[PDB]
């Protein structure tokens, strides 16, 4: 992004915020943090919002089947699980009984 003008950066930021408002509608902690983040004169608030998001995700990982703490890395493991489960779903068809 270093080789872009500020107008494009603001456009992306605004559209991302538009998506976030809907994504985070139900939660309250994240909603409060996002609310606090939008004053341009206090930048660290945005990174604090980011930290809140990451922690919130880490609680929801369900490590019974997954081990990565970083969610971004956890995406690949969910993808692998989908592929493997779809493969197991194939067929057996040895059906014969009383």
């Amino acid at each position: 992004l270093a080789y872009m003008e500020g107008g494009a950066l603001r456009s992306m930021s605004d559209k991302a915020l538009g998506a976030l408002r809907l994504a985070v509608a139900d939660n309250e902690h994240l909603r409060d943090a996002l609310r606090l983040s939008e004053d341009p004169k206090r930048p660290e608030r945005k990174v604090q919002f980011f930290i809140a998001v990451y922690q919130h995700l880490r609680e929801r990982i369900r490590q019974d089947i997954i081990r990565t703490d970083d969610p971004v890395d956890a995406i690949e493991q969910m993808e692998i699980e989908l592929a493997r489960l779809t493969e197991e779903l194939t067929a057996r068809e040895q059906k014969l009984a009383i």
């Binding site: 080789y3 993808e79 592929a83 009383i98």
Partner: protein
């Protein structure tokens, strides 16, 4: 400077994707040829992991088939035998011996030999008309005559020996059966053995799960590298523009 500036963002995006990709792997890439050789090593790991996966699958299939033979109703060649048991006024022999103890089970299994899973039918002439119709049955069907409710020991020319039994089946014919372990009859503890088999098959299921997961991981890694080269080589491994612009 204008040329370098136009070129820079593409090179930077390419570098970020490359760093993510190689860091995701254990080995660090440095050139196009290097990436290709890494492709080849990835293929070799695919085709090894798949072989172990398939072999474990074969073992698991054998285990389920073995377990299934011991299931129902009195574990036998159940596919046709149950219908064949009711289509004549008879009872399955293995079912008559459902209750026998573990100590007499090997003896009886040796005694009855292949005929363990025959049917008891007290006349054997009433089947003679039905018989021509039997086109759907095990390749060797055994029939015995006696009272199904209080069946007497079939007249065998039997003779007990050390850990074995001798029998005269016919004039000029004898059979000699050695005591097996974990027999057919006594289908009370044969549930004990299928319990042992369930415990055995659990491990195969677990191991197969891990191997399949590994194969999928390798396949997706190859997909990632292919996607990369499809979208990336135009500027891969080129010299850093930040430096030259600074100069």
């Amino acid at each position: 400077i204008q040329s370098l500036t136009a070129r820079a963002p593409v090179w930077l995006a390419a570098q970020d994707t490359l760093n993510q990709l190689c860091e995701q792997s254990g080995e660090t890439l440095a050139s196009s040829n290097d990436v290709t050789e890494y492709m080849q090593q990835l293929l070799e790991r695919e085709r090894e992991a798949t072989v172990e996966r398939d072999e474990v699958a074969a073992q698991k299939r054998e285990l389920e088939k073995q377990i299934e033979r011991l299931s129902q109703p009195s574990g036998a060649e159940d596919s046709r035998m149950i219908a064949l048991a009711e289509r004549f006024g008879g009872v399955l022999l293995s079912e008559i011996y459902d209750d026998i103890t573990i100590d007499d089970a090997p003896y009886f299994s040796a005694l009855y030999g292949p005929a363990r899973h025959g049917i008891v039918v007290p006349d054997l002439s009433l089947v003679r008309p039905h018989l021509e119709t039997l086109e759907d049955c095990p390749e060797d069907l055994y029939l015995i005559e006696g009272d199904p409710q209080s069946f007497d020991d079939s007249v065998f020319n039997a003779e007990e020996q050390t850990n074995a039994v001798l029998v005269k089946s016919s004039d000029r014919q004898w059979r000699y059966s050695r005591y097996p372990e974990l027999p057919l009859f006594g289908r009370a503890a044969r549930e004990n053995r299928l319990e042992a088999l369930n415990l055995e098959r659990d491990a195969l299921a677990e191991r197969y799960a891990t191997l399949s997961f590994d194969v999928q991981k390798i396949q997706r890694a190859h997909q990632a590298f292919s996607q990369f080269v499809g979208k990336h080589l135009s500027v891969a491994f080129d010299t850093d523009p930040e430096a030259e612009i600074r100069e």
